[PDB]
Coordinates of C-alpha atoms in Angstrom, one line a residue:
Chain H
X6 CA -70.9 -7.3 -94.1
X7 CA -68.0 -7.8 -91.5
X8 CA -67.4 -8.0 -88.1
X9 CA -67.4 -4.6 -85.7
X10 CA -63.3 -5.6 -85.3
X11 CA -60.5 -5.9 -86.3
X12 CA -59.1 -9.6 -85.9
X13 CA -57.0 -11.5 -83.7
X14 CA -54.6 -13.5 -85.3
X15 CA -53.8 -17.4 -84.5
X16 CA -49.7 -17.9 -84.8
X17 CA -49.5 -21.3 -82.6
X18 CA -50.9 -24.5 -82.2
X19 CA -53.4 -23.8 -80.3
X20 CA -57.2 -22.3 -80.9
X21 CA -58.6 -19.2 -79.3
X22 CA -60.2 -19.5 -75.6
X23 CA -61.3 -16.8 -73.4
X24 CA -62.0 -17.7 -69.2
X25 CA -65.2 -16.6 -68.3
X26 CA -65.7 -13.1 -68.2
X27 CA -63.0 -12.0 -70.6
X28 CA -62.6 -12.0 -74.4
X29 CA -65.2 -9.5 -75.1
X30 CA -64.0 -6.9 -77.3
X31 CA -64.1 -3.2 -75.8
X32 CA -66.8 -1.1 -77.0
X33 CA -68.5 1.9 -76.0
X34 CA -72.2 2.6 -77.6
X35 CA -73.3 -1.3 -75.8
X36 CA -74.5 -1.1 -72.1
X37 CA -73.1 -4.6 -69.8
X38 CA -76.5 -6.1 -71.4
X39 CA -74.6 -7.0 -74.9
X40 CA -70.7 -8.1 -73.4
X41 CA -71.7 -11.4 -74.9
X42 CA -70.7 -13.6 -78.7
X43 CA -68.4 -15.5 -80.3
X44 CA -65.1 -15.2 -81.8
X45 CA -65.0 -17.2 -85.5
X46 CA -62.1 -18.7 -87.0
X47 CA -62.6 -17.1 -90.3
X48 CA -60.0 -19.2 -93.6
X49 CA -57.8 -17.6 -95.6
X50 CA -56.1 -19.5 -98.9
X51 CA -54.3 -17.4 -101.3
X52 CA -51.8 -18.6 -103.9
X53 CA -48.2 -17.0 -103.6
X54 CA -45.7 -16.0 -105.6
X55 CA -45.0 -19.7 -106.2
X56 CA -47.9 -20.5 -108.0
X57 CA -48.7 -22.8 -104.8
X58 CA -52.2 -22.4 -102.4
X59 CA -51.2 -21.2 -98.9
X60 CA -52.8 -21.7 -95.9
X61 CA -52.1 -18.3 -94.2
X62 CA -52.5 -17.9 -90.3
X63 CA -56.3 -18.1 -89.2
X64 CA -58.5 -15.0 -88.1
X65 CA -60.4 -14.7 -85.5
X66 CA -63.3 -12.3 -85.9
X67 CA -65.9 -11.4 -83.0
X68 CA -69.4 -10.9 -83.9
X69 CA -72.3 -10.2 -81.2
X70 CA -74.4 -12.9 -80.0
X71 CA -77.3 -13.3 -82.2
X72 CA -75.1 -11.7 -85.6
X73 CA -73.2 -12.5 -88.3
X74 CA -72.4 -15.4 -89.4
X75 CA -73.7 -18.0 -87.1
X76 CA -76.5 -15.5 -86.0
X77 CA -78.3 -18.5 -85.6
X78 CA -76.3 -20.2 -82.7
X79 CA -77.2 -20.3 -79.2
X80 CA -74.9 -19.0 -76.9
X81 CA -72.6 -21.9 -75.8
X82 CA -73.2 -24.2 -78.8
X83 CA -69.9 -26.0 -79.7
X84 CA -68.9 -25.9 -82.9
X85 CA -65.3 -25.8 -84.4
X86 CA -64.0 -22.6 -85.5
X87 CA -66.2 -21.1 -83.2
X88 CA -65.4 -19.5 -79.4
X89 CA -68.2 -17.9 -77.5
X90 CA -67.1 -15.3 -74.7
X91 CA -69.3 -13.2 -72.0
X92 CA -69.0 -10.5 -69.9
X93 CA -70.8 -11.0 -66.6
X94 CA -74.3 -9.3 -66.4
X95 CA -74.8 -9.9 -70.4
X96 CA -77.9 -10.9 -71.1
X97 CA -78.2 -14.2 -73.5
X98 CA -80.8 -11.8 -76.0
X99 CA -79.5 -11.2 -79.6
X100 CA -77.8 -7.9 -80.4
X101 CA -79.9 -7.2 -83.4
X102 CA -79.5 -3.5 -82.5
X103 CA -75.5 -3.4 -83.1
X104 CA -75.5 -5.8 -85.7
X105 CA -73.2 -5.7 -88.0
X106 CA -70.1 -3.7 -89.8
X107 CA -71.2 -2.1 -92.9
X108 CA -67.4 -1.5 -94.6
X109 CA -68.6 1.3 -96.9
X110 CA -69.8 3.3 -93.9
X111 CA -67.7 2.4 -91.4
X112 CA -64.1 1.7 -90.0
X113 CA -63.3 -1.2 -87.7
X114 CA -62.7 -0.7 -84.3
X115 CA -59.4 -2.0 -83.2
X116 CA -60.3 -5.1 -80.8
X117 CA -58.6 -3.9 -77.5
X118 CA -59.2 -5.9 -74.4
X119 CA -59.3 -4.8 -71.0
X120 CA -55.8 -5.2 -69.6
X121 CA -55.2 -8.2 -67.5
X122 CA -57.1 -10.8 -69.8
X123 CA -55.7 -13.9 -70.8
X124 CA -54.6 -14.9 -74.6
X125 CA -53.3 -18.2 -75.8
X126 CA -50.0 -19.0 -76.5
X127 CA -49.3 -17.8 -80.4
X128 CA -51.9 -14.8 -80.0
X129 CA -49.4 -11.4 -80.4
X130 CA -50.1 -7.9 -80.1
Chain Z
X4 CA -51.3 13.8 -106.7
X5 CA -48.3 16.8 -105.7
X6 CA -45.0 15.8 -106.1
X7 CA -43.0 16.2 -102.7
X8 CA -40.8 19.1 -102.7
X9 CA -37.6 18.6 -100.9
X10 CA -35.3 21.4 -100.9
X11 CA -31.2 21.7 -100.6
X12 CA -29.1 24.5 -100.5
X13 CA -29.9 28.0 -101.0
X14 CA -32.3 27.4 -104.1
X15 CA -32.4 23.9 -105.4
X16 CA -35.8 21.8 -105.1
X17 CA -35.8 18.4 -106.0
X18 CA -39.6 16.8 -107.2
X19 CA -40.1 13.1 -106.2
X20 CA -43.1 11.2 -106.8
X21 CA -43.1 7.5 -105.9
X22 CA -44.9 5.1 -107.1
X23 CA -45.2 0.9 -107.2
X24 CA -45.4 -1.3 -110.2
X25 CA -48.7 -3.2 -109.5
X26 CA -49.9 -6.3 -111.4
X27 CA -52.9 -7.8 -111.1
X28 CA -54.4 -11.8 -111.3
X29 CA -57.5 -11.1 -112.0
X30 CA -59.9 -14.3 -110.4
X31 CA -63.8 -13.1 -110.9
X32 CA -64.7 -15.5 -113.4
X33 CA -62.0 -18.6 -114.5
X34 CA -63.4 -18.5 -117.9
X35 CA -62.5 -15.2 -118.7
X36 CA -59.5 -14.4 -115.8
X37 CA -57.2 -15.2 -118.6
X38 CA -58.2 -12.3 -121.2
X39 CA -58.6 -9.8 -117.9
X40 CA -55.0 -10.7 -116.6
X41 CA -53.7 -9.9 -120.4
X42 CA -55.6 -7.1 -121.2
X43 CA -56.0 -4.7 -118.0
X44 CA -53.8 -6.3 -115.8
X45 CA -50.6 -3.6 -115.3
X46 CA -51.0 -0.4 -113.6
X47 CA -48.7 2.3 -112.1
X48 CA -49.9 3.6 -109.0
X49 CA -48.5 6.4 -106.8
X50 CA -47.6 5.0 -103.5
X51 CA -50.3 6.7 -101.3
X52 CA -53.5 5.7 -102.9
X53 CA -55.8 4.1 -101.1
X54 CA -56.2 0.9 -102.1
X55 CA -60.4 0.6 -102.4
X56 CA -59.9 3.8 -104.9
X57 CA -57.5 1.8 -106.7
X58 CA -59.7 -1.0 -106.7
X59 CA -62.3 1.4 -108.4
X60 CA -59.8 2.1 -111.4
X61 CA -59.1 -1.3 -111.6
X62 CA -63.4 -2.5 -111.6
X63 CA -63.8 0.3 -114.6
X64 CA -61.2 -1.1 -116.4
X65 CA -62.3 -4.7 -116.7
X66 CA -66.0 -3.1 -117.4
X67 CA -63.8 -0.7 -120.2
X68 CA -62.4 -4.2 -120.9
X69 CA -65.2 -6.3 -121.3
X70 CA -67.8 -3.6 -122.6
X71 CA -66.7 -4.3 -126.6
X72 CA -67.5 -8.2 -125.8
X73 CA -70.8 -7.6 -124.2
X74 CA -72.5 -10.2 -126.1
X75 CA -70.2 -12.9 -125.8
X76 CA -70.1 -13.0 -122.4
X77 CA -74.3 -12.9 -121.8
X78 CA -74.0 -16.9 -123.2
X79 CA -71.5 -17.6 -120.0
X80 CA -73.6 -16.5 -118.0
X81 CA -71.9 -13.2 -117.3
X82 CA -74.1 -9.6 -116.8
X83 CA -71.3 -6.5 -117.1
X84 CA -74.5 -4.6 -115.6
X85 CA -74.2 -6.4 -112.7
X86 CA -70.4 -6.5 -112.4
X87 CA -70.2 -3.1 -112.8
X88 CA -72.1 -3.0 -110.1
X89 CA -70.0 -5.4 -107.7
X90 CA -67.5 -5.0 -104.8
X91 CA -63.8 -5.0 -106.2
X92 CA -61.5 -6.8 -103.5
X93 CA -58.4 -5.9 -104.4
X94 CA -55.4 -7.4 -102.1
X95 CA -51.6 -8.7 -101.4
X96 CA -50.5 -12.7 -101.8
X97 CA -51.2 -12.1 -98.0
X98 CA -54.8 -11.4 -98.1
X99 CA -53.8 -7.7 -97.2
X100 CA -55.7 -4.6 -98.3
X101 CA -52.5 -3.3 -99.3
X102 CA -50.7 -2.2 -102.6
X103 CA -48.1 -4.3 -103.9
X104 CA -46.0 -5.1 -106.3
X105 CA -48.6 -8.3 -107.2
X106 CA -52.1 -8.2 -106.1
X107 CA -55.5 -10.4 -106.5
X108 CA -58.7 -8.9 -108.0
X109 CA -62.0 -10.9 -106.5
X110 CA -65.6 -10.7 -106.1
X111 CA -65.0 -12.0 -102.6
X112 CA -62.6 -10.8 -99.2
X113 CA -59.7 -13.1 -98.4
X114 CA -61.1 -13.9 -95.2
X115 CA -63.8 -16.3 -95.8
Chain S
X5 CA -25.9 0.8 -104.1
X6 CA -27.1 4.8 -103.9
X7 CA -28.5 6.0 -107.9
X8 CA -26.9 9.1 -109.0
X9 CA -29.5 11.6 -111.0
X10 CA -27.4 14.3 -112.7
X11 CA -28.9 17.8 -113.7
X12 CA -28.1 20.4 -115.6
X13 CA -25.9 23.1 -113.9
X14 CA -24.0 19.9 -112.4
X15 CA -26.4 18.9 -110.1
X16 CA -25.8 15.6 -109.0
X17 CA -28.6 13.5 -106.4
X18 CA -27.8 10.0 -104.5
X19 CA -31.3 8.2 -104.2
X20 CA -31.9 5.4 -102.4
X21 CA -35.3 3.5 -101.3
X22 CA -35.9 1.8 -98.3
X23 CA -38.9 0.1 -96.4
X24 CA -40.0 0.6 -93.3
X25 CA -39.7 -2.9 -91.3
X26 CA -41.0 -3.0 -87.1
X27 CA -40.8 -6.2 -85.5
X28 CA -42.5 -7.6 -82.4
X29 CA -39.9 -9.6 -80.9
X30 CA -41.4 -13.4 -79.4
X31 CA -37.7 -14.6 -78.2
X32 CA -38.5 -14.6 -74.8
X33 CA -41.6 -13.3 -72.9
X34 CA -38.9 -11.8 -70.4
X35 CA -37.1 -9.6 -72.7
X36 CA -39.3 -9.2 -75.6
X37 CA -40.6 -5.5 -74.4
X38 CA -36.5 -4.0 -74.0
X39 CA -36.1 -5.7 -77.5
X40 CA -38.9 -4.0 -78.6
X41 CA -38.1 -1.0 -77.4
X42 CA -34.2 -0.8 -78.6
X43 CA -33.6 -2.6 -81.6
X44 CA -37.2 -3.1 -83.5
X45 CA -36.9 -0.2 -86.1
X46 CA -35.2 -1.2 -89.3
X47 CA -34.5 0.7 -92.3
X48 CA -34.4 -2.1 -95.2
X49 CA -33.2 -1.7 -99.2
X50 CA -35.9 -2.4 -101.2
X51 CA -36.1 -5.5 -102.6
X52 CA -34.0 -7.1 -100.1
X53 CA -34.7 -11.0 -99.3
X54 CA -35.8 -11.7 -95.7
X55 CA -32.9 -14.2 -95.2
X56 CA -30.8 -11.5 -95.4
X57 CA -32.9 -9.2 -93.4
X58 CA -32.7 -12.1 -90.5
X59 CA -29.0 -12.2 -90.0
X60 CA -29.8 -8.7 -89.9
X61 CA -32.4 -8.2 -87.0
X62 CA -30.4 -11.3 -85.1
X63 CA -27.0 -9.4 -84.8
X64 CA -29.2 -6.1 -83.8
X65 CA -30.5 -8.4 -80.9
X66 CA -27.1 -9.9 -79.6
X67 CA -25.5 -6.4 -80.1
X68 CA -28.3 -4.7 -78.1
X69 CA -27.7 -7.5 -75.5
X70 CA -24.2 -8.3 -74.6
X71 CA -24.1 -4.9 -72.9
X72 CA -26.6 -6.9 -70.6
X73 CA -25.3 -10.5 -70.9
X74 CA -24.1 -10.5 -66.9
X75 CA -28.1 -9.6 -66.5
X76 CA -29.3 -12.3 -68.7
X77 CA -27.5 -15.3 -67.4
X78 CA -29.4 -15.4 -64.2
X79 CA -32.9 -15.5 -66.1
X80 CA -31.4 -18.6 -67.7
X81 CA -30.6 -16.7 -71.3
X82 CA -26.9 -17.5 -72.6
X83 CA -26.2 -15.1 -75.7
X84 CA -23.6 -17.5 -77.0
X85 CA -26.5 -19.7 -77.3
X86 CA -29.0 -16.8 -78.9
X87 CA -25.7 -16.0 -80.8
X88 CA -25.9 -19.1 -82.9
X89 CA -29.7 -19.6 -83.1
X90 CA -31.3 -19.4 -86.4
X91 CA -34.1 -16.4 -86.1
X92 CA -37.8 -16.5 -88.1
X93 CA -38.8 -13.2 -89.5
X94 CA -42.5 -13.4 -90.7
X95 CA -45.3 -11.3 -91.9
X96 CA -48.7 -11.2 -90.0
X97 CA -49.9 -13.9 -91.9
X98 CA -47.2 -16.2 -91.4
X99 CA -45.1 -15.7 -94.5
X100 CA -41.6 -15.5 -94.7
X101 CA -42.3 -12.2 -96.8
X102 CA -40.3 -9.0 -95.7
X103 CA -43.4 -6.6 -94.4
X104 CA -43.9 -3.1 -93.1
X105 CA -44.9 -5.3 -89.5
X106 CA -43.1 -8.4 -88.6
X107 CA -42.7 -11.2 -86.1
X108 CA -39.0 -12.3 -84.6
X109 CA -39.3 -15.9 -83.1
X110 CA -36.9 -18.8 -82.4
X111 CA -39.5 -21.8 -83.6
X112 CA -40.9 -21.4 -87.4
X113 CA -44.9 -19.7 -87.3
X114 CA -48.2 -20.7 -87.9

């Protein structure tokens, strides 16, 4: 089982943040009550054509607050690899109702954000 | 599937399929990887397959592969009934559902 | 070099194959969208190295430039500079692997 998105993708330095209010992805079929989770860094080691283990660039995934992965962390809970992001008027209850992507049945949404929000440096479109 | 028809002149047509050269490291089990990435590893795939229905020739071939040797793989530890019944992953040296010329076959995505 | 297929009734066909290559340019925030917009489409022989394909994209980008270069020089960009830079091409993973989507920067990825 996978996230409702598609992933953003980590080419710099630096670690995905969100100011308040933004990061959540856009998606129609949640009311303003479930704008609210946490991007996580997800790993990715494959061996290349070399014969060598490579590190390739880190993936962010989003899942709803109270799903996936760390279903069990509480909103705000700092963790590495972990982001959390809100829109305002969510409501810190889990999202048992979208929970997760089901691969088999489903296609992942493209993560879009509303225009105007704020990625770090190395974050691409 | 069709081959494309491309036409010139007042009556020639020109078939083209394409295809990619695809070979496979298998990594499901270490103990037995080896045998898989000499026996069913090379396939020729036309270019616009999807790659989870590729993965689906690729999973019945290592059950085809491993049917004969049932018995010696029960001891390891290893159920063909159950792997049959597994998730193929099938992806690029980038961790990309996407064919290529070399690809990985796991029980598990490349994001992790 | 284009493969020649000959037919019977002297039918002769010139195949070549190619790969689709777009790049998102990351030179400068400034720019990056005309670059986009004017020199990100490439047409690349198969099996081509992406070291190759570099010195490719970068003389697309000073070519689709210098028409400009009077414009350039007052957002503090010098193309004789950008003309001797080394440019990364890599995949959306990183790699320096030639890909159907790739990345143009002047500082090596992550």
């Amino acid at each position: 089982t996978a996230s409702w998105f598609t992933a953003l993708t980590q080419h710099g330095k630096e670690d995905l943040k969100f100011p308040r209010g933004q990061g959540v992805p856009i998606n129609t079929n949640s009311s303003p009550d479930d704008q609210i989770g946490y991007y996580r860094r997800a790993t990715r080691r494959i061996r290349g054509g070399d014969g060598k283990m490579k590190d390739l660039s880190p993936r962010w995934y989003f899942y709803y607050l109270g799903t996936g992965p760390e279903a069990g962390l509480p909103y705000g809970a700092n963790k590495d690899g972990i982001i959390w992001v809100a829109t305002e008027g969510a409501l810190n209850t889990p999202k048992d109702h979208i929970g997760t992507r089901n691969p088999a049945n489903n296609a992942a949404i493209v993560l879009q954000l509303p225009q105007g929000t704020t990625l770090p440096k190395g974050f691409y479109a | 599937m069709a081959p494309t028809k491309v036409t010139f002149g007042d009556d020639t047509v020109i078939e083209v399929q394409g295809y990619k050269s695809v070979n496979i490291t298998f990594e499901l089990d270490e103990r037995i990887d080896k045998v898989l990435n000499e026996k069913c590893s090379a396939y020729t795939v036309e270019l616009g397959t999807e790659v989870n229905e590729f993965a689906c020739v690729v999973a019945d071939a290592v059950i085809k592969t491993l049917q004969p040797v049932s018995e010696l793989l029960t001891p390891l530890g290893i159920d063909l009934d159950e792997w049959s019944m597994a998730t193929y992953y099938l992806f690029d040296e980038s961790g990309e559902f996407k064919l290529a010329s070399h690809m990985y076959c796991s029980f598990y995505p490349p994001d992790e």
